[PDB]
Amino acid sequence: SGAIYVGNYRVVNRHLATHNDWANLVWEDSSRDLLVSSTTAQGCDTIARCDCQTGVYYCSSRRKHYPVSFSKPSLIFVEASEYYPARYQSHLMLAVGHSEPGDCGGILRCQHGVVGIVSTGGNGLVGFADVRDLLWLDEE
Numbered sequence: 051s052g053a054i055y056v057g058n059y060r061v062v063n064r065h066l067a068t069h070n071d072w073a074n075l076v077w078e079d080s081s082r083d084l085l086v087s088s089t090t091a092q093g094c095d096t097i098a099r100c101d102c103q104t105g106v107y108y109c110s111s112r113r114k115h116y117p118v119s120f121s122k123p124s125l126i127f128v129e130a131s132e133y134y135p136a137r138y139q140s141h142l143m144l145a146v147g148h149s150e151p152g153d154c155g156g157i158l159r160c161q162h163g164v165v166g167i168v169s170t171g172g173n174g175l176v177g178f179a180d181v182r183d184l185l186w187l188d189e190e
């Protein structure tokens with residue numbers, strides 16, 4: 051579990067969005083596994099605006115943050131998980147590291163701020179849904 055709180059937006063994995071998220075929907079994209087809903091309180095996170103490929107992510111299933119190198123966001127085939135069938139996911143970054151289903155929502159961060167959230171796992175990789183292209187998260 052986990053979210054990004056930027057401005058008056060809450061960014062969550064689409065597959066973990068709640069009814070309240072859907073009832074306050076801003077934007078969602080199944081191919082990216084992302085959903086954004088509106089919030090009443092302003093959030094503490096800053097979105098990275100960069101093309102870093104190194105950062106640190108939180109792994110709930112280890113209670114640890116790990117430094118990783120990761121691929122640039124791409125269209126990637128993802129094997130079946132507990133929450134999606136096998137399918138292509140867009141805007142996905144991969145690193146070598148541990149990720150189970152409940153790790154989804156952990157933040158990946160670089161020197162510029164939040165890069166994305168855990169979205170995929172298995173076979174010794176962790177996949178992160180990028181948010182750095184969503185420039186509108188920083189205004190309105």
Ligand SMILES: CS(=O)(=O)Nc1ccc(CN)cc1
Pocket residue numbers: 123124125126139140141142183
């Ligand atoms: C190929 S992909 O998975 O859609 N990722 C992607 C898409 C668009 C841009 C925007 N410059 C960058 C990366």
Ligand SMILES: CS(=O)(=O)Nc1ccc(CN)cc1
Pocket residue numbers: 130131132133134135136
């Ligand atoms: C059958 S599967 O490989 O476990 N993948 C899967 C997981 C969850 C849903 C949603 N109920 C759909 C497909």
Ligand SMILES: [Zn+2]
Pocket residue numbers: 098099100101102160161162163
């Ligand atoms: Zn960066």
